[PDB]
Amino acid sequence: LPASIFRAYDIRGVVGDTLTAETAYWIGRAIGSESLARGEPCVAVGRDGRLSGPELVKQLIQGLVDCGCQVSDVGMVPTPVLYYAANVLEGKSGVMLTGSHNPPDYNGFKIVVAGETLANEQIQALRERIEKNDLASGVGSVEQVDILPRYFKQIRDDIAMAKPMKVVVDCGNGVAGVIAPQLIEALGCSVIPLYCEVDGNFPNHHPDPGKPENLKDLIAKVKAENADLGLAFDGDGDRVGVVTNTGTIIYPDRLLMLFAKDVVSRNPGADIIFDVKCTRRLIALISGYGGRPVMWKTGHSLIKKKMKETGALLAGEMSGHVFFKERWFGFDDGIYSAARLLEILSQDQRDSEHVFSAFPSDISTPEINITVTEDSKFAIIEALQRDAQWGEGNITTLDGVRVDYPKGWGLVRASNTTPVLVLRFEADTEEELERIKTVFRNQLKAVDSSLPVPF
Ligand SMILES: O=P(O)(O)OC[C@H]1O[C@H](O)[C@H](O)[C@@H](O)[C@@H]1O
Numbered sequence: 248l249p250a251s252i253f254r255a256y257d258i259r260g261v262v263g264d265t266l267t268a269e270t271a272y273w274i275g276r277a278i279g280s281e282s283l284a285r286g287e288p289c290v291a292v293g294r295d296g297r298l299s300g301p302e303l304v305k306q307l308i309q310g311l312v313d314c315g316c317q318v319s320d321v322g323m324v325p326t327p328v329l330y331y332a333a334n335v336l337e338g339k340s341g342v343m344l345t346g347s348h349n350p351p352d353y354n355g356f357k358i359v360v361a362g363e364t365l366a367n368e369q370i371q372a373l374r375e376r377i378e379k380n381d382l383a384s385g386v387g388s389v390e391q392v393d394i395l396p397r398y399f400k401q402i403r404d405d406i407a408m409a410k411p412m413k414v415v416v417d418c419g420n421g422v423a424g425v426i427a428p429q430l431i432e433a434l435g436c437s438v439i440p441l442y443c444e445v446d447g448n449f450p451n452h453h454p455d456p457g458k459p460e461n462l463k464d465l466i467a468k469v470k471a472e473n474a475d476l477g478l479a480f481d482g483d484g485d486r487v488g489v490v491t492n493t494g495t496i497i498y499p500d501r502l503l504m505l506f507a508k509d510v511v512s513r514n515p516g517a518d519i520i521f522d523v524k525c526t527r528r529l530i531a532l533i534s535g536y537g538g539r540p541v542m543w544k545t546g547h548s549l550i551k552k553k554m555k556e557t558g559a560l561l562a563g564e565m566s567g568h569v570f571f572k573e574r575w576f577g578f579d580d581g582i583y584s585a586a587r588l589l590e591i592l593s594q595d596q597r598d599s600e601h602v603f604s605a606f607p608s609d610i611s612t613p614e615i616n617i618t619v620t621e622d623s624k625f626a627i628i629e630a631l632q633r634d635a636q637w638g639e640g641n642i643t644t645l646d647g648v649r650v651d652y653p654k655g656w657g658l659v660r661a662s663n664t665t666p667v668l669v670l671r672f673e674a675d676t677e678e679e680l681e682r683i684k685t686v687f688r689n690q691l692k693a694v695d696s697s698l699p700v701p702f
């Protein structure tokens with residue numbers, strides 16, 4: 248199998264090219280072998296709404312079966328519903344077949360074994376098992392499990408909206424259309440659906456709410472229908488994007504402000520995790536409410552590991568993955584996060600625009616990407632960590648280099664999903680933003696004078 252599909256956070260490839268039916272089978276063999284090595288014969292399996300779903304999921308399941316695993320096949324579900332299965336069934340392993348927000352031909356695997364979401368060396372260990380033929384052999388079994396009604400009821404029964412809201416819901420023709428509009432209505436909303444038919448051709452915008460262009464239709468519909476809120480889901484439903492009643496995009500780090508206030512209010516001293524891409528304002532806000540802010544690495548599986556290590560009650564990252572442990576299970580879930588948001592907003596007499604605008608804001612950049620090479624990106628970061636000078640500031644090298652200054656911050660790190668450097672900048676003023684950008688421009692040039700500095 249090609250090494251490139253074994254990534255830091257998950258497995259991801261292109262069907263017909265780097266990901267085939269046979270590769271899915273052997274990946275299932277590897278996962279079932281690791282699950283058995285951890286004392287867990289029971290493995291839940293789910294798939295999203297992609298065209299290659301049926302082909303690859305059958306092979307994934309047979310690979311698990313051929314280890315001697317007992318598979319619980321939950322069919323086509325959102326990613327968090329597969330994570331839910333792996334938390335509420337007797338078995339604590341699960342595999343989701345998904346390509347997330349990528350174009351139609353992409354697919355992949357998000358993997359939980361004996362309660363732990365695999366990352367980094369553990370994902371490589373699967374590749375290595377297949378190369379070594381270090382694989383279990385047995386006569387397993389498959390049972391059908393219809394889990395979505397239990398998930399739906401679990402959420403509905405714990406959410407208490409204080410008044411009705413009208414909400415536009417954009418599923419981007421991804422799998423969130425199997426539940427999100429239905430569940431949000433059941434909470435006590437009117438729902439205007441946009442692209443809520445599941446269609447793996449993604450004939451409208453790709454289900455990727457991190458790009459403003461994929462929210463254009465949502466924003467227009469919110470305005471036209473005088474809705475209270477707009478929500479957009481990514482293809483597999485583990486990410487959510489939010490738009491206010493006036494069309495303002497609320498990025499996930501400011502959504503986390505509202506959620507952190509909520510969670511900490513009932514849980515004094517609670518740890519709250521955010522990634523290195525998130526606003527410094529969220530850090531002061533968590534501390535102010537008496538929570539413990541914990542900055543960590545970008546990446547869903549890395550965040551989940553950190554939540555286990557710290558006992559954090561809430562985590563989020565700038566990509567829109569939000570992870571509730573309080574009243575929940577600790578995994579990322581756009582659908583559940585949407586419900587928690589509606590709960591909070593419904594208890595406020597103000598519109599969603601004013602709830603969010605009340606929080607301090609700074610000037611920030613759209614995420615910047617510089618294309619380098621896959622085989623150099625980590626070395627550029629290592630060179631910065633060894634060589635760079637940042638002036639006076641609080642330097643964090645847990646994921647790339649982030650420097651927090653009195654009036655702003657900057658970040659450079661390697662993407663683990665693409666061959667690029669990722670940068671973000673934020674400051675109280677344009678003048679400071681430009682000062683920080685100049686520091687980073689010059690430090691990149693000091694490592695390699697030839698690097699593009701397109702910011
Ligand atoms: O910045 P990157 O390493 O490219 O990762 C950006 C995002 O990629 C995927 O969407 C993962 O599911 C997210 O957890 C991560 O935040």
Ligand SMILES: [Zn+2]
Binds near residue numbers: 326483485
């Ligand atoms: Zn996703």
